[PDB]
Each structure stands twice: as C-alpha cells, then as structure tokens.
C-alpha cells in the first residue's frame, strides 16, 4: 500500500540502477491491460 | 475456445463491452480482440462467425 505512492513518481528508480523498469513493465503488460492504463499507473507519457 | 473464455472473463474486453445487457456488437468485439492481440485477424473472423 505504501509502495503504491512511488509508482508514478518521475524518479522511482533512483538507487536501483535499472533505469528501464517502466519501459519493461509497459512492454510486458501493455497489451493485456492497456498501454494507456499502464502508462497512467506508472506516470509516463508516450506522446511526450 | 479456452482463450476466448479467458478473454471474456478479462475486464479489458469488458471495457469495450458497453451495452447494459452485456451483449457486445460485432465491431466492438473485433476491436477488443485486436486490442488484446491474442487472436490474429482470420481467427477473429472465425470467432465472429
């Protein structure tokens, strides 16, 4: 529940070195659950 | 015919579902299958049939 707060923050992976976590999650779960929904959950903007 | 049961159970396709009666239109069904990407076009046509 507390971690739910950090999902959409711009700097979520600040200490963990993997900077492609959001892109990997989007590519993995975008089709089944919706690219727009995943992007909204993770605070990323495909158009940008 | 197992994946279709799974998809109808899935909520993402039920988002394309809009009719209060729960019955979906042919075009809405086609769009939902395309969005899910589990089925190719010929398969989608078959399940429509």
From Swiss-Prot, chain A:
Highest rank taxon of the organism: Eukaryota
Name of this chain's protein: Ryanodine receptor 1
UniProt note on tissues of expression: Detected in muscle and myotubes (at protein level). Ubiquitous. Detected in diaphragm, skeletal muscle, esophagus, spleen, submaxillary gland, adrenal gland, cerebellum, brain and in testis germ cells.
Similarity section: Belongs to the ryanodine receptor (TC 1.A.3.1) family. RYR1 subfamily.
Gene: Ryr1
Residue window of the full protein shown: 4698 to 4745 of 5035
Comment field on protein domains: The calcium release channel activity resides in the C-terminal region while the remaining part of the protein constitutes the 'foot' structure spanning the junctional gap between the sarcoplasmic reticulum (SR) and the T-tubule. Pore opening is mediated via the cytoplasmic calcium-binding domains that mediate a small rotation of the channel-forming transmembrane regions that then leads to channel opening.
Inactivation phenotype: Perinatal lethality, due to severe defects in skeletal muscle development. Neonates do not breathe and do not move. Mutant mice show defects in muscle fiber development. Their muscles do not show a contractile response to electrical stimulation. In addition, mice display abnormal curvature of the spine, thin limbs, and an abnormal rib cage.
Source organism per UniProt: Mus musculus (Mouse)
PTM comment text: Channel activity is modulated by phosphorylation. Activated by reversible S-nitrosylation. Repeated very high-level exercise increases S-nitrosylation.
